[PDB]
Design a protein that fits this description.
Chain A: Keywords: Blood coagulation, Calcium, Coiled coil, Disease variant, Disulfide bond, Glycoprotein, Hemostasis, Isopeptide bond, Metal-binding, Phosphoprotein, Secreted, Signal, Sulfation. The complex is a heterotrimer of chains A (298), B (306) and C (65). With 298 residues, chain A is α+β, with helices and mostly antiparallel strands. Chain A has helices spanning 8-38, 58-64, 113-118, 135-142, 206-209, 231-235; strands at 45-46, 70-74, 83-89, 95-102, 120-123, 131-132, 149-156, 162-168, 171-172, 181-182, 185-186, 247-248, 273-274, 286-293. Chain A contains six helices and 14 strands. Chain C has one domain (1-65): Single alpha-helices involved in coiled-coils or other helix-helix interfaces. The two termini of chain C are 15 Å apart. Classes of the chains: A alpha+beta (298), B alpha+beta (306), C mainly alpha (65). Bound molecules: 2-acetamido-2-deoxy-beta-D-glucopyranose and calcium ion (3 copies).
Chain lengths: 298, 306, 65
């Protein structure tokens, strides 16, 4: 209610005590703020990192010292640019360069020539992603000056059962020859030599119509199969088609593994199959294709 | 004296209210900073599995099958190591390499010269439970890298922005080049077309004469608050276009637009909000005027094919 | 002007200055806190109410006159 005009001198001298105090605190606050700004300049930590160790291939790298699987940069001797890959390094010190992977169906494999040439999908440090490295890369790797390579095919059903098929002298040719697939011989494996053909009984030429050694790569937009029609298209994928296949790892990913002829408007057997192991109406749950210098495959 | 002495008391009561009020707002702020300091004892994280397909830049990648907009790895030139970048493969026929992106204020842009040289921010982040980072983070690729990409060959620049009301306009530059560091990353643009307003080449629409001219960025040099290379030729340390907390840009005297300005929430901001009263902040005068901070701002480049 | 009536003129401006200074600190802190979003585990969700600052300012410009 308006007090003595004699208090004003203390009251006035009071608002000053809480004024300078305020400015004081504000200064320390700003300091505190400077410190906060410092703890906020960095970017989020990316779990996925790439190792520095490089080489002509995973083996070359593994030998150099790398000991764990993970993404790496390799550059085969004749390659222009270097390119990222997924290396698998076991205890024995074998660097496997993986170029094909299936495990969930998240990645569509109904791609064209270019994409199959360049590669698609994602690379992951924990080999938990699906992909196709790219015909050109695979080619470069498998045809390094005087280095016999070996291809291992690992399968796995919807029951935790795995199998492997190995091929010695694995090779993939240049685009001039449509990335022709070739190998010297089936180097063994409980998975079964599906690349040699398989007799179904539908025709007397089955074996002939389903062999893969020597077959050129095909995609819907680039027919190179031994069929008057289009294998890659019908199955909706990219692969070394004959007429059409006995072993087909880039097939449609049928969840459950078990599919039938009543799965398409044509009854095609366009799944992830490998005749020697399971029936043609069983699409694998996992699929991995890796290579490594033959002179290392035990 | 008599009644004027009545202001004094009612006056003391006022200030008393404020000084004790602020002293509390301070208390609030202090509390707030201590909390954020604790959340910073640990970082944010990402898991960006790298796509297989790669190339010299986004254009080559899309021509190689990369059709989805996400983070890619590119090796512009064989001398330098491959680096992550975000590729816009949908906007106007895709093949756009993002070199600058603003959208939420998650990243600080008021950095020194070195960081604008190397790059900073977050390129990409993981989208709704996915092993690949399909959304772009806020970032500046880094002067060196931008200089190299634009020189590789004829490069066009696409600038996109959005206001806090959902509106969108674009700024296109048929020709865009940024020189190397020795040349202070001097910028050159041309062949405009768009709806955002040609602020880089012409200058602020609101200005006239030498004023609308001294706000022209084309031909300017790059400056950061710790490295003056602007149009202001004087010794007055108080006239520099880039002050603390301000971003690095191609400042003149001083700007028509600043994609690298402070991220003010809401859009409109005033002189008593700005650290220096100067108007830093994601501006593009030719469309929203002088004191408006965009909600989204991005800079994308693509090899120019006539 | 008497001594006391002159010590007030000083404060009025002082607070007006400290108000602007706080208004600024407020925005600065908001911007910086948000910029921790891209570096730290999380960012303190907040919202500044410039309104109170906008009121205390006028409320003070009037009493100064
Ligand atoms: C340039 O700026 C000065 C100072 O603000 C002003 O006096 C002059 O009128 C401006 N030029 C224009 C746009 O007329
Ligand atoms: Ca055919
Ligand atoms: Ca800074
Ligand atoms: Ca200067």
């Amino acid at each position: 209610y308006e007090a003595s005009i004699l208090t004003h001198d203390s009251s006035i001298r009071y608002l000053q005590e809480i004024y300078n105090s305020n400015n004081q605190k504000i200064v320390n606050l700003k300091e505190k703020v400077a410190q906060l700004e410092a703890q906020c300049q960095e970017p989020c930590k990316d779990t996925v990192q790439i190792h520095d160790i490089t080489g002509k291939d995973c083996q070359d790298i593994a030998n150099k010292g790398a000991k764990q699987s993970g993404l790496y940069f390799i550059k085969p001797l004749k390659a222009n640019q270097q390119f990222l890959v997924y290396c698998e390094i076991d205890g024995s010190g074998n660097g496997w360069t993986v170029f094909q992977k299936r495990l969930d169906g998240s990645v569509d494999f109904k791609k064209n020539w270019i994409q199959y040439k360049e590669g698609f999908g994602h690379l992951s440090p924990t080999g938990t992603t699906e992909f196709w490295l790219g015909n050109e890369k695979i080619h470069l790797i498998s045809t390094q000056s005087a280095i016999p390579y070996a291809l291992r095919v690992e399968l796995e059903d919807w029951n935790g059962r795995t199998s492997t098929a190995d091929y010695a002298m694995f090779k993939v040719g240049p685009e001039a020859d449509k990335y022709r697939l070739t190998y010297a011989y089936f180097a063994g494996g409980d998975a079964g030599d599906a690349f040699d053909g398989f007799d179904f009984g539908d025709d007397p030429s089955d074996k002939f119509f389903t062999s893969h050694n020597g077959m050129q790569f095909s995609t819907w937009d680039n027919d190179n199969d031994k069929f008057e029609g289009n294998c890659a298209e019908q199955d909706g994928s990219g692969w070394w088609m004959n007429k059409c296949h006995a072993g087909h790892l880039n097939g449609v990913y049928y969840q459950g593994g078990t599919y039938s002829k009543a799965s398409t408007p044509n009854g095609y057997d366009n799944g992830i199959i490998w005749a020697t192991w399971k029936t043609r109406w069983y699409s694998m749950k996992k699929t991995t294709m890796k290579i490594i210098p033959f002179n290392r495959l035990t | 004296d008599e009644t004027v002495n009545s202001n004094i008391p009612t006056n003391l009561r006022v200030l008393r209210s404020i000084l004790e009020n602020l002293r509390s707002k301070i208390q609030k702020l202090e509390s707030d900073v201590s909390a954020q300091m604790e959340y910073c004892r640990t970082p944010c994280t990402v898991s960006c599995n790298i796509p297989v397909v790669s190339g010299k830049e986004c254009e080559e990648i899309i021509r190689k099958g990369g059709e989805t907009s996400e983070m890619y790895l590119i090796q512009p030139d064989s001398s330098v190591k491959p680096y992550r970048v975000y590729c816009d493969m949908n906007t106007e026929n895709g093949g756009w390499t993002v070199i600058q992106n603003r959208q939420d204020g998650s990243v600080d842009f008021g950095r020194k010269w070195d960081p604008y040289k190397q790059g900073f921010g977050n390129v990409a982040t993981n989208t709704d439970g996915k092993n690949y980072c399909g959304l772009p983070g806020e970032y500046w690729l880094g002067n060196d890298k931008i200089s190299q990409l634009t020189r590789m060959g004829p490069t066009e620049l696409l600038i996109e922005m959005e206001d806090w009301k959902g509106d969108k306009v674009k700024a296109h530059y048929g020709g865009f080049t940024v020189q190397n560091e020795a040349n202070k990353y001097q910028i050159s643009v041309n062949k405009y077309r768009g709806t955002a307003g040609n602020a880089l080449m012409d200058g602020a629409s609101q200005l006239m004469g030498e004023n609308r001219t001294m706000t022209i960025h084309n031909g300017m040099f790059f400056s950061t608050y710790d490295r003056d290379n602007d149009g202001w030729l004087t010794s007055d340390p108080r006239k520099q276009c880039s002050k603390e907390a301000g971003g690095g840009w191609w400042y003149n005297r001083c700007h028509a637009a600043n994609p690298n300005g402070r991220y003010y929430w809401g859009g409109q901001y005033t002189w008593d909000m700005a650290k220096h009263g100067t108007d830093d902040g994601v501006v593009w005068m030719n469309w929203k005027g002088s004191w408006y901070s965009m909600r989204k701002m991005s800079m994308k480049i693509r090899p120019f094919f006539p | 002007v008497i001594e006391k009536v002159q010590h007030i003129q000083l404060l009025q401006k002082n607070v007006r200055a400290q108000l602007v200074d706080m208004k600024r600190l407020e925005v600065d802190i908001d911007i910086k806190i948000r910029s921790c979003r891209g570096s730290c585990s999380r960012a303190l969700a907040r919202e500044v109410d410039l309104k109170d600052y906008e009121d205390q300012q006028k409320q003070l410009e009037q009493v100064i006159a």
